[PDB]
Amino acid sequence: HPETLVKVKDAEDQLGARVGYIELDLNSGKILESFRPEERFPMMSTFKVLLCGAVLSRIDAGQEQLGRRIHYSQNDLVEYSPVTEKHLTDGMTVRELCSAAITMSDNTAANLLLTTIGGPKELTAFLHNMGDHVTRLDRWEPELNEAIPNDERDTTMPVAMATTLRKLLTGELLTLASRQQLIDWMEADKVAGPLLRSALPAGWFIADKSGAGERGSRGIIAALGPDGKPSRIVVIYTTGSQATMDERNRQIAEIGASLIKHW
Numbered sequence: 001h002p003e004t005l006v007k008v009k010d011a012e013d014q015l016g017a018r019v020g021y022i023e024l025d026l027n028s029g030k031i032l033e034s035f036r037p038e039e040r041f042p043m044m045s046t047f048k049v050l051l052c053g054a055v056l057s058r059i060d061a062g063q064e065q066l067g068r069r070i071h072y073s074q075n076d077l078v079e080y081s082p083v084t085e086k087h088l089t090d091g092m093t094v095r096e097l098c099s100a101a102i103t104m105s106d107n108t109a110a111n112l113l114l115t116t117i118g119g120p121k122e123l124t125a126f127l128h129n130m131g132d133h134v135t136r137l138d139r140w141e142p143e144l145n146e147a148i149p150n151d152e153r154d155t156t157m158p159v160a161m162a163t164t165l166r167k168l169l170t171g172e173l174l175t176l177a178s179r180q181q182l183i184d185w186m187e188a189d190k191v192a193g194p195l196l197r198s199a200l201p202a203g204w205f206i207a208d209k210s211g212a213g214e215r216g217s218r219g220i221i222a223a224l225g226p227d228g229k230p231s232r233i234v235v236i237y238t239t240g241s242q243a244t245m246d247e248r249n250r251q252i253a254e255i256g257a258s259l260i261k262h263w
């Protein structure tokens, strides 16, 4: 809708930085609205959805199990790991790790899950396979959030991320069971409160994954819709702003409010 774009361009002004936006009809896959759809942005923690998609794909092929318990040590822990830091003794199941990575944005959980599939380059390989030759992961947490301008490492394009997230949720890449498992994890997101969710009205469905990183990097990917069902895919990225977290959260929220208003 034209008015949402008005707010996207106004978010750019407010943040003094590029904003990438795209809106996909879930059913048809048709682009409803876009802005900088084919420019690169750092993925940040939003890649953790693609990662767990990669893990579920392996489970589908009988190469991994949700119940497999993984043990790790102090030395594996990095910053922001509010779940994996509690289970040094008991370890965690693959399922628990993917939960923590997606619902809590747990960095170590993500690293642990990257180790299971053979690292950043295997996730990028997994991506090339399903037909996304743009989204790339090159580093581990937390180095991937660096967000150096013009640096293409650890970046995606809104239109690629959106299209890729649509394939993972509604495509054949994953079994019905894994598709549902992935969506439920995104639906139980615990840390994205001040983004799209803060504009989301009661009764609406949302499954999302947020991201934060450096140099004002902030993002979110979501499947959402009215009446308790997702009906569109939304991707919002920004990088380069010197604004505070709160200011950046608000601009995203406000894009979300406009998105909802002109649904």
Ligand SMILES: *[B]([O])([O])[C]([C]C1=[C]C(C([O])=O)=[C][C]=[C]1)[N]C(=O)[C]([N])C1=[C][C]=[C][C]=[C]1
Pocket: 044, 045, 046, 079, 080, 105, 107, 141, 142, 145, 191, 192, 209, 210, 211, 212, 213, 214
């Ligand atoms: B991620 O964005 O790759 C990671 C962890 C993180 C995620 C989120 C979110 O909304 O998903 C919010 C905050 C942190 N980012 C970092 O580890 C990054 N170094 C960082 C950490 C704290 C604050 C800003 C950036």
